[PDB]
């Protein structure tokens, strides 16, 4: 009934450490405490029994070793290596591969995490409010240009539009049918996505038949559209994504943020 999938890959976006043959993306010392330590703590807090970690082509046994030695764990962790990984494909191709192993609801949590927020309340929200998908956004660093945009709702708390500023037209465009149904659409600039994903029971059917997803963002939350034409088969509860805001300083790592995280950790 309850399970979690842990995403692992390779450091491509990072500049300075990751290109070494023996050092993996999952096992990295940034600020004394390891990268997958926090994730393990989170999982422990969440009371999930069976957790299966998905591994890339590189590092097959190192991750296992990490899981085993040094660390409290006390849980049956399984590390599996699928074949269809090309990177040029982060985790969607892994997700597509592993679907009969899923019995109930699954939670997606990557290897890279800096976390400080309460973990139970997300899960509880996911459980209660009768929703298929839930994601998290956290404030930008307040300590002394083109960024990213996200949509939020305030009363129920919903997500509608999530597209970035990488590849788009010069003028920002909004759809008419996407605006009339659900009238209030607050667009924030400061918020950053922490890449925490929650999935319900009815998601396994779509991946095996028609793949369209890129970086677990393109065809995952955006194809919720039951407007204009309706030419895609749904699984029945209407398809609706959700979002929740948090105050504490805990975010993602991609660019030169590692050095800031170091500064943060010591307090």
């Amino acid at each position: 009934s309850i399970q979690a999938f842990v995403f692992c890959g390779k450091g491509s976006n990072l500049a300075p450490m990751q290109h070494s043959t023996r050092l993996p993306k999952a096992l990295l010392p940034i600020g004394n405490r390891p990268m997958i330590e926090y994730v393990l703590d989170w999982c422990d807090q969440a009371d999930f029994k069976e957790i299966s970690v998905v591994a890339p082509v590189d590092e097959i046994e190192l991750i296992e070793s990490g899981l085993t030695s040094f660390l409290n764990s006390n849980h049956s962790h399984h590390l599996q290596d699928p074949k269809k990984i090309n990177f040029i494909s982060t985790g969607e191709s892994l997700q597509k591969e592993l679907l009969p192993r899923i019995n109930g609801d699954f939670v997606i949590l990557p290897c890279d995490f800096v976390t400080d927020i309460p973990p139970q309340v997300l899960v509880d929200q996911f459980r209660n409010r009768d929703d298929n998908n839930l994601a998290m956004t956290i404030y930008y660093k307040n300590s002394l240009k083109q960024q990213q945009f996200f949509t939020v709702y305030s009363e129920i708390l919903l997500d509608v539009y999530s597209q970035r500023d990488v590849t788009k037209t010069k003028y920002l465009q909004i759809r008419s049918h996407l605006l009339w149904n659900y009238p209030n659409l607050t667009v924030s600039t400061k918020l950053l996505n922490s890449f925490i994903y929650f999935c319900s029971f009815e998601l396994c059917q779509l991946l095996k038949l028609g793949p369209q997803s890129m970086s677990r963002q393109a065809s995952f939350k955006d194809p919720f559209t039951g407007n204009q034409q309706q030419q895609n088969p749904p699984t029945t509860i209407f398809i609706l994504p959700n979002e929740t805001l948090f105050i504490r300083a805990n975010n993602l790592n991609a660019y030169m943020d590692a050095n800031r995280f170091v500064l943060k950790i010591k307090s």
């Binding site: 010069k170 909004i174 049918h177 009238p183 209030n184 924030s188």
Partner: protein, 431 residues
């Protein structure tokens, strides 16, 4: 803060109310027995205006007469009414220009466009405006906003879009779309110049239009400078925003209280319904603002004035109003309708969500379902109407007539169906 002057824009959205306006004007018309300008006047009084400017053009003489008859020409009031003359059918810019040419304004002035019925205490708002002005020199006008009724699905005529701020509250963009009536457009474009200077953005579409502005002594000068502007909401504010004068800012204000402007028929109906319910707290008929009125609130949402004659064996519904001097016979099954002052009724009228204005004579046997009857128009025998029917001024409806949905009736004794004289669409007669 003492000594204030206000400019009220009356007679602006004619022909939009297509069946009416031929002899009698738009603003002079009553909501529930009492005219729409009266509320505005009351609001002005509450605010504390000392000099009132009113614009009249079409059917202006009657308006003037009404003003004269109202209790404000007499010297007891702090404010006096002066009329501005203008040619038939004009834009809001020309009038502004004329006003500027005349030259009266010293300091802050209130510009109200359209017909607004509102219950918000405004002293606080004024104070806020003052405080904001005291912050920085280059600041112009204040705007009013209110949360929409449930969902904007019945409100198709007003698709007002707003981009706002949390910290300082400033508007950016305005857009309109049809959608369920006609499915055509799917694109809206937003300005990319200023983003990081504001940081916080709240985009909202579910907001009721008010079109009320509290303005400083800059607007007429601005209008003089750039004479390309036609309307204040569509072109002007946006223009100001998009680097017209560098450093100038505008205000946005939010209030949860009831404030809706009249522009279409369905909207008007909704407003009437709201009034019938207990949504308005300072604006209830039982208080009697006009002093000539003698209305009193009764059980089961029924409004009644003093001295009403009604015959035995009748059933009543919900959210109804009955004026004074009404002579009603046996039958009436009244549900969700307003009836004007002094109305003679024969026998048996089945009423479902109807509407009747001042001085109407209804004959014998009529089944009326969701339609409006104007002033001095008489109903004969056998009248049956469908949803969303509007009857104009002085229409003498004779014997045996049947009409379906969206049938409009003329007021002039020109372009629309059903003539004011004898028999409507059963024998074509008249001019």
């Amino acid at each position: 803060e003492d000594r204030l002057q206000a400019v009220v824009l009356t007679d602006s959205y004619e022909t939009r109310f297509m069946p009416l306006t031929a002899v009698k004007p738009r603003c002079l018309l009553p909501l529930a027995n009492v005219p729409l300008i009266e509320y505005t006047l009351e609001f002005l009084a509450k605010a504390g205006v000392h000099e009132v400017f009113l614009i009249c053009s079409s059917h202006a003489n009657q308006i003037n007469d009404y003003i004269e008859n109202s209790k404000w020409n007499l010297p007891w009031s702090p404010f006096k009414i002066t009329t501005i003359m203008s040619p038939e059918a004009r834009c809001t810019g020309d009038v502004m220009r004329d006003l500027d040419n005349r030259g009266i304004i010293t300091g802050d002035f209130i510009l109200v466009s359209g017909d607004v019925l509102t219950n918000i205490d405004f002293s606080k708002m004024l104070e806020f405006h003052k405080k904001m002005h005291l912050q920085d020199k280059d600041h112009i006008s204040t705007m009013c906003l209110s949360k929409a009724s449930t969902y904007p699905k019945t409100r198709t005529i007003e698709p007002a879009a707003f981009v706002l701020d949390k910290s300082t509250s400033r508007c950016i963009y305005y857009q309109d779309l049809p959608l369920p009536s006609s499915r055509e457009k799917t694109s809206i474009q937003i300005d990319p110049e200023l983003l990081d200077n504001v940081d916080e953005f709240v985009i909202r579409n579910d907001l009721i239009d008010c079109r009320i502005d509290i303005c400083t002594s800059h607007v007429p000068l601005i209008f003089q400078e750039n004479f390309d502007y036609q309307s204040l909401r569509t072109d002007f504010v946006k223009g100001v925003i998009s680097s017209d004068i560098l450093g100038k800012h505008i205000y946005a204000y939010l209030t949860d209280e009831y404030a809706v402007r009249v522009e279409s028929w369905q909207t008007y109906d909704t407003i009437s319904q709201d009034f019938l319910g207990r949504w308005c707290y300072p604006l209830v008929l039982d208080s009697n603002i006009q002093d000539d009125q003698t209305y009193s609130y009764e059980s089961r949402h029924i409004y009644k004035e003093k001295d009403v004659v009604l015959a035995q064996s009748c059933k009543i519904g919900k959210c109804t109003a009955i004026g004074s001097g009404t002579k009603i016979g046996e039958g009436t099954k009244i549900e969700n309708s307003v009836i004007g002052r002094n109305c003679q009724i024969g026998e048996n009228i089945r009423i479902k969500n109807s509407f009747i204005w001042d001085d109407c004579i209804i004959g014998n046997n009529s089944i009326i379902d969701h339609s409006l009857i104007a002033s001095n128009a008489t109903l004969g025998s056998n009248v049956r109407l469908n949803d969303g029917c509007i009857i104009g001024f002085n229409v003498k409806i004779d014997d045996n007539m049947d009409l379906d949905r969206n049938t409009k009736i003329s007021a002039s004794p020109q372009d629309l169906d059903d003539q004011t004289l004898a028999v409507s669409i059963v024998g074509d007669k008249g001019v």
